[PDB]
Design a protein around this nucleic acid. Structure first.
Lengths: 695, 695, 79
RNA sequence: AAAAAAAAA
């Protein structure tokens, strides 16, 4: 017999129902969390024996949208769900980022969270349910986990926040925000606004968290009811003796080594002190593990840099907290792309290039909720020759498919509606040099490129990453944090919007609790920095160009009869294939008879128009048709005319005189007007050269 | 001028042509076997030096169907043969399963059998030829190998077995089983039958074996002719000292531990026993191999459990050999899937979900034999958390692609014929905890889910996995064998049929010398256990639900006049495309008048059928024909009523005198009755107002 | 391969049928694609020589111009 | 012989 421990509550309008104990009894824990007929079956399995000699914590969070949820057989040719799509990868990252800061420091047991989506309802998005499920499953398992973590989505409708808006409500809403936080404080935010002021976004975050408190309480109750006993796990007791021994020698020398302004001399000096210290550490005692010493060194570096930045001393870069790294924007770097730009800030650099296309190229996304065509593709490539180290290129890693979406959220607030711009922009942005905040450089460069290729966007957008270092009650906010600063910093929060309003937020706090006022101060400082960046960006190019680049495919529209569209299709499309191959353009066919002529140069466009027009032109009374007989035989020569309908001039219809041979009657290259009297349906159109040859 | 060695023999109606020595000389041994113009080129490469510290036999059997065999350029966009399809993986497992228990124990040199298909007569299926080829190759190579193995594919027609039928016959046979065994015993059997009684199945097995004795004899002849000298490979002699100091010190204690009925106490006891034995033996000598120590320990405990079950003592579970594990059955566990079930037996369970789709989703796979459309998809998912360990979710491994086909072979016997039920059932079963006999749990859950979603299958169907332990003349046969028992047990059955007859008989014996009487007894016990499981299943769901779920797309078929399809539809598909884009349903037509209406809503299907009846409106006596005339011209009154139905209203039928303005006597938009006088060949339709106003 | 035969242009309508029932029935029977032009030139495209022979024979039975000395199978259906 | 335009581219 099976004993399903169910526990259901009320969240917003729907009724979440946690249900554990019935399935996957062999995994460490598994709950089937269902909200309003949308069910996600999260399961955790974490090994007990720590891998001998591990350095980084290997938590992986697969997320699978099984397409038998909506009730459809998949569309792929193998007719089976395969490699995870971009949406599923993004939602896996969204599940991953809240929990990882919660696993206690020094934990290195493999842990895997495989949250599938068994059944979906088009009104309720699954991802929020999957997040609740991952939190509940982890809390049940007894793996060392600091807290249950609620998840909420907030929408802005008619100036009142709504919790967990349904998709139909979401279309109306200005802001779509996901706030996931523990009982103590916000843990992550991943938003996409529509140029709201910073106060509205902060209100949204605080509202979402204050509300999801309920999910937290109820998951806690479930854990108390039907959970497993907590693991007996203790962190590695800190070897105070070795740490203090290494510190007594390294503290002052490394403090002064980091005090000096020049970066690379400090690099060399700290590396040589590192080699000296590790050589002594080995020579005095071989048994001491190298990774322990490396952890010690990381601790010393983090401690000294944090102590410095807290006191107000200049950062490792040499800038003040407010100062942004110097920028240099360039446009038209690439010769033949529809529009390109190169946004170099400090060391982070991005070569963004925007290319227009016609409606045939818009991505057609088949996801669980419903079918959807996307007409703004943003791709973000992070090649390994950026950081400075070799590495195999390949399919885009998870972080690239996350930052693509982030930059796309950043830019989507300002793109023009399709009726005003009948194109499908695709923006790529390779990162040639990365030193921190690559995605926001990509947002800036995308604004630049779009402004250059001629898209009539509303106003330039710009993104500036930020940081936070807080100890006790002493806190100081940072701007344009380098990567080295980010590792030491306690929070990284990325705001990207126009001067008027915020287009995209993506906080990721990691330590203790951040009071609302702290977030407010950080957001305001970010507004200032972003205004400065936008000024500099405006210095280069301030208004989008007059028209698209000459290479860009212009749009020409012709009207033809509804039967004519089938005529131009032909067998499987042979006529349109031949037309595109002979003309070199791109033709779109609609059932109402509209024709879309898309070609770069106007000459190819008019070429296509004429070539199609001859076949579209119906043979008209009085107007003679241009026909060339392709084959002549002794018993008659038929003048092939085209259009699927050929009129044959039988040997008995030419003249009453005995036609002896067509060669002396019709010669090779005899282009003569033919008098057509009518258009018949019997398949035997009457042609007559006799009346045209009389004069 | 190298010379091949050719030996050809009769094998049923087909003739087989073994041939070696001409190609692939540098491979260890290669044999091109051709049967009746189907040729499969099998080659085997065997390394000579065992990899150091190798523990498991790394034999890997590949199999590639080169689509230039049938004489066709590949379909795929790259015009090149892609990764192995599901069929090729299936036949790879087919070739693999018989020849793995045949290599001697302790052989660990890598071996690879690559079987290519170079020319395929669309009648003779290749798999049998490839199996004969792999047997001939291995037995030719001189890699240590017990015996050449023959393959047959017995069919069942007119209650008479037939050897190795062709596709044309196979469309009429009830049972197709690939009994491939050496001369001594039937090594492997894989079956698919339409509810044949067990006795017929076992008769087919024994007949196939008696027949393929021929291939055995002649492969032996060819090996004696043109073989290679056998490798000099000797098994590692067992170390009597280690065996004695483990046995005489611990084996009695392990026997007493396995006497304990409880699982967990016994676990703890065997743990402390093995730890104590290891500790004392290393205290005696440290250089003693811990790996070999544990290996001998595992051998000891295997011997203990085998002796226990042989004596007739209760098994590790505590069940008697006959009784099945516990059961629990739930149906409709997911909210929005078309049908679902959760078949949980003992500690092996499966979440099956059947999802109906319209006829456009049927997987169309291109095989060498000929393009075949598949309208029943079974998919088997074995995620890692099921067995309790973390792993790498990804593309389905080989064992899944095998068990999916097994379960589909088990269910296909009972699914309805396409005329009675026109859909595209796709069944997905995800194992959530597996401890032996997972695939048969999947078959049970699939029968349940199908019965839930509302398909009218002919009868419920269930599966049980038998196990056999045999020593000398003493043999005991188990039921619902656990995962742990299976390795220790010798042979494995998987019977899966309705109460009336068997449907799948996959079996995989290892020991040599099982009389057919033993298999008869085993199948009898399996019939008993399967009747029991079906009795339990009968409680939850009795008969298939009358109506499919409201979420299901509903397909409605109407018959129409096949001649009138050209009159109402017309050329070019204009009106059909218009109707499919206005109603959003899919419409097709047959030469007889068969037309299917498929739409995810009932009311939409009603709208579509209304439109079809309006366009296909006959001439109903007494029904009012409404025409809306908005403008009048001198030639007539143009009225748009669809279907090209337009008649020219003559001026002489309006009034006797010349009408100066038509609107004085005929009103605009006024309903005029129109009775058809006759339907001419040229589509001439005339309207009659005068005779229709009064009648 | 592509098989080309020249048939009298006027007799195509005897065998084409109303709405093309005969031609499509024959193609689905022989598994090939037949092509006919207003000049009566019959184009048989096939994926095999054997299907080519099958289709071409079936064309000879009906589609071929009426030949003297060709026997016609006449069966009464009702007395 | 009824019909835009390719994971198986």
């Amino acid at each position: 017999m099976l004993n399903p421990i169910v526990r259901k509550f009320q969240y917003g309008q729907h009724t979440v129902t946690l249900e554990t104990g019935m399935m996957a009894r062999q995994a460490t824990a598994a709950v089937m969390v269902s909200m309003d007929d949308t069910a996600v079956f999260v399961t955790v399995v974490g090994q007990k024996k720590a891998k001998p000699g591990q350095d980084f914590f290997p938590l992986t969070v697969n997320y699978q949208e099984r397409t038998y949820a909506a009730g459809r057989i998949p569309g792929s040719f193998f007719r089976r769900e395969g490699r995870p799509s971009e949406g599923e990868t993004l939602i896996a990252r969204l599940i991953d980022r809240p929990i990882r800061p919660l696993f206690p420091e020094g934990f290195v047991n493999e842990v895997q969270v495989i949250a599938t989506v068994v059944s979906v309802n088009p009104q309720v998005n699954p991802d929020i349910v999957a997040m609740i499920g991952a939190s509940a499953a982890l809390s049940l398992s007894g793996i060392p986990f600091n807290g249950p973590i609620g998840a909420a989505r907030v929408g802005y409708i008619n100036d009142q926040y709504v919790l967990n808006p349904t998709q139909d409500e979401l279309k109306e809403s200005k802001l779509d925000l996901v706030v996931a936080g523990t009982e103590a404080a916000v843990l992550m935010v991943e938003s996409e606004a529509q140029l709201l002021s910073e106060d509205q976004m902060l209100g949204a975050v605080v509202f979402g968290h204050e509300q999801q408190q309920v999910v937290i309480q109820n998951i806690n109750e479930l854990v108390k009811e039907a959970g497993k006993p907590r693991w007996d796990w203790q962190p590695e007791p800190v070897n105070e003796a070795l740490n203090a021994r290494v510190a007594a020698l390294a503290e002052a020398r490394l403090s002064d080594a980091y005090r000096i302004t020049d970066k690379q001399e400090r690099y060399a000096q700290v590396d040589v002190i590192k080699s000296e210290t590790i050589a002594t550490l080995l020579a005095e005692d071989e048994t001491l593990d190298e990774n322990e010493l490396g952890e010690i060194l990381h601790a010393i570096e983090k401690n000294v840099v944090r102590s410095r930045v807290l006191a107000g001393e200049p950062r490792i870069d040499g800038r003040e907290k407010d100062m942004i790294r110097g920028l240099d924007v360039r446009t038209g770097v690439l010769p033949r792309t529809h529009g390109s730009a190169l946004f170099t800030r400090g060391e982070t650099q991005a070569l963004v290039t925007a290319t227009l296309g016609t409606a045939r190229d818009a991505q057609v996304l088949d996801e669980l909720m419903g079918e959807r065509t996307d007409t703004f593709l943003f791709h973000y490539n992070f090649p390994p020759y950026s950081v400075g180290e070799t590495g195999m290129v390949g399919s885009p890693k998870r972080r690239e498919i996350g930052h693509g979406r982030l930059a796309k959220r950043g830019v989507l607030a300002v793109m023009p509606d399709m009726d005003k711009f009948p194109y499908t922009v695709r923006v790529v942005s390779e990162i040639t040099e990365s030193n921190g905040s690559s995605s926001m450089a990509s947002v800036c460069g995308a604004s630049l490129a779009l402004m250059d290729a001629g898209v009539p966007i509303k106003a330039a957008v710009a993104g500036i990453a930020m940081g936070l270092v807080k100890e006790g009650d002493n806190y100081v906010v940072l701007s344009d944090i380098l990567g080295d600063e980010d590792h030491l910093g306690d929070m990284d929060f990325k705001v990207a919007g126009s001067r008027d309003g915020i287009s995209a937020l993506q906080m990721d706090i990691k330590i203790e609790g951040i009071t609302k006022e702290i977030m407010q101060v950080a957001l305001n400082q970010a507004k200032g920095a972003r205004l400065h960046i936008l000024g500099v960006m405006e210095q280069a190019i301030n208004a989008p160009r007059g028209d698209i680049s000459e290479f860009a495919p212009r749009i020409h529209t012709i009207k033809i009869n509804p039967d004519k569209i089938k005529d131009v299709i032909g067998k499987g499309g042979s006529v349109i294939r031949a037309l595109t191959e002979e003309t070199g353009t791109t033709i779109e066919i609609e059932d109402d008879g509209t024709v879309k002529i898309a070609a770069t140069d106007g000459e190819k466009a008019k070429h296509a128009i004429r070539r199609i027009e001859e076949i579209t032109a119906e043979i008209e009374v009085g107007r003679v048709y241009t026909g060339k007989v392709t084959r002549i035989v002794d018993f008659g020569a038929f003048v092939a005319i085209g259009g699927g309908k050929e009129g044959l001039v039988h040997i008995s219809q030419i003249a009453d005189k005995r036609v002896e041979k067509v060669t002396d009657y019709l010669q090779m290259g005899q282009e003569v007007p033919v008098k057509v009297l009518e258009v018949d349906r019997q398949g035997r159109i009457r042609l007559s050269i006799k009346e045209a040859t009389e004069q």
